[PDB]
Design a protein around this nucleic acid. Structure first.
Ligand SMILES: [Mg+2]
Ligand SMILES: [Mg+2]
Length: 97
RNA sequence: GUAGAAUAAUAGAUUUGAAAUAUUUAUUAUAUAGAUUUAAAGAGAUAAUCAUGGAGUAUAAUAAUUAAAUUU
């Protein structure tokens, strides 16, 4: 197998209920730093994709991490910026087929 | 147009499927192994912008008289 998902290796599970899904949401909105996607996935035996599906982080959290991305991009040099645009175009060309 | 029906966005609302081939889907650093790429101090070719040079071209008094052709 190549880049296979864990659920695909061992099939999907449907075992969480409304109350613990709601409390997952409360934890995520409370302390996104302490209760990360991987932490919640480990705690509740689900996938980080499912955590993102059911929960939603805080606006402050997303704003600060977008700013972090902006800083990392700004610290780049000319060559890395061009290389990243090239990666984007190449990846887009993957799907045209 | 003294006015309405008539495309897409931009967002909004109300619904909507999923545990979503996410131990890499999007993008983000380090380390190891390996494979590579990227010059313009100047130059060639071509074109253009400035020159240089004076080939080529026109004219050889351009006044006036005579003659043929014209607006009123
Ligand atoms: Mg070059
Ligand atoms: Mg000259």
């Amino acid at each position: 197998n190549v880049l296979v998902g864990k659920s695909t290796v061992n099939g999907k599970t449907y075992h969480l209920g409304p109350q613990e899904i709601d409390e997952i949401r409360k934890l995520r909105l409370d302390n996104p730093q302490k209760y990360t996607r991987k932490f919640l996935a480990a705690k509740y035996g689900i996938s980080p994709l499912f955590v993102s599906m059911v929960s939603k982080p805080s606006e402050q959290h997303v704003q600060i991490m977008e700013s972090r991305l902006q800083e990392i991009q700004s610290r780049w040099k000319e060559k890395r910026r061009i290389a990243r645009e090239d990666r984007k175009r190449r990846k887009l060309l993957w799907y045209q087929a």
